[PDB]
Design a protein around this ligand. Structure first.
Ligand SMILES: CC(C)[C@H](N)C(=O)O
Length: 344
């Protein structure tokens, strides 16, 4: 008697790379759980939904999931699309574990049926600021964001921390996502002789900004959130992605204990290096731990906040809001290689 689990993320669109990572992680974890017998004999069955990381299409997905009788949702990914979906799931008694949404607002609303297998930007932001103040110490900072929930929230958090350190923030600018042309911004960085730029947003925009900055002879150092730390950034920017600083989950694919999963994934020619392969795999293991105790959303949610669950990410424990206790983002150097190393 299969147990339906909706996996929802961007499978198409501008940031389909987030979904490629999520589905790869969900697929392998379900393959592993089922291989050992699943949940007390019952196998997990993945039902795939594409919300294109679009708020309107995510609601349409939420309504279909509620309608299809599915009780557990592993997703969505982007915060502004997860928000509206989340509310429909909460009002409807459907558990929702998100492996990528980081805006604080998600777990700040009293929801009793939401959990994350990733951290909060209330931590990610501060970490970038601290690192800039203590290790980079630039002289002329500019901050750019895409006017979206995730990017602006992070951009304002970083501005905040830099001010507390009395750093020199020359300007705070918001750009429109989807635009491929940034000559104006670039010409401005050159003009203001900006030596450091924190960018709050996704890889599509970061990739264009980076290419256009190097093409104009700028050596400006850039830094972005985990949202820009992925192979699609390197695809778009080419060598211009080299040198980029990023905050992002720890390299779980490097944990020696995890090598069997890395191998199984590589054997299907899929990419196991993305952070979301692991948070999603972890989300599936949390749901497994839950389904072993009960099939009822509230019961599962209760049980998770009550226990420490061992996962590919290490032991996980959640607060009453459904956030990971003690989660920490590291700062890394990103390489055109699709590789990432500990930052100085
Ligand atoms: C990268 C993406 C999933 C981002 N963390 C967000 O909350 O939108």
């Amino acid at each position: 008697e299969d147990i339906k689990v909706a996996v929802v993320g961007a499978m198409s669109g501008p940031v389909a790379q987030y979904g490629d990572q999520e589905f790869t992680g969900a697929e392998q974890a379900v393959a592993d759980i089922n291989a050992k017998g699943g949940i007390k004999g019952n196998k997990l069955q993945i039902v795939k939904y594409d919300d294109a990381c679009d708020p309107k299409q995510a609601v349409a997905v939420a309504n279909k999931v509620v309608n299809d009788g599915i009780k557990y949702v592993i997703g969505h990914l982007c915060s502004s699309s997860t928000q509206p979906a989340s509310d429909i799931y909460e009002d409807e008694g459907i558990l929702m574990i998100t492996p990528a949404a980081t805006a604080p607002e998600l777990t700040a609303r009293g929801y009793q049926l939401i959990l994350r297998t990733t951290g909060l930007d209330s931590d990610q932001g501060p970490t970038a600021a601290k690192y800039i103040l203590e290790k980079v110490k630039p002289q002329r900072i500019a901050i750019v964001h895409d006017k979206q929930q995730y990017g602006e929230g992070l951009a304002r958090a970083v501005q905040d921390g830099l001010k507390k350190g009395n750093a020199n923030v020359v300007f705070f600018d918001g750009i429109t996502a989807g635009e491929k042309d940034f000559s104006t911004l670039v010409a401005r960085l050159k003009k203001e002789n900006i030596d450091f730029v924190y960018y709050g947003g996704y890889h599509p925009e970061m990739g264009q900004i980076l290419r256009q900055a190097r093409a104009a002879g700028l050596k400006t150092q850039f830094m972005g959130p985990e949202g820009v730390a992925n192979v699609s950034l390197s695809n778009i920017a080419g060598e211009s992605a080299e040198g980029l600083l990023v905050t992002k989950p720890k390299n779980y694919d490097q944990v020696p204990a995890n090598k069997p999963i890395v191998d199984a994934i590589k054997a299907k020619k899929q990419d196991p290096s993305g952070a979301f392969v692991w948070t999603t795999y972890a989300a599936l293991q949390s749901l497994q731990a839950g389904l072993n105790q009960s099939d009822d959303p509230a019961e599962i949610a209760k049980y998770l906040k009550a226990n420490s669950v061992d996962t590919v990410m290490g032991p996980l424990t959640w607060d009453e809001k459904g956030d990971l206790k003690g989660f920490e983002f590291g700062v890394f150097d990103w390489h055109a290689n699709g590789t990432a190393t500990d930052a100085k």
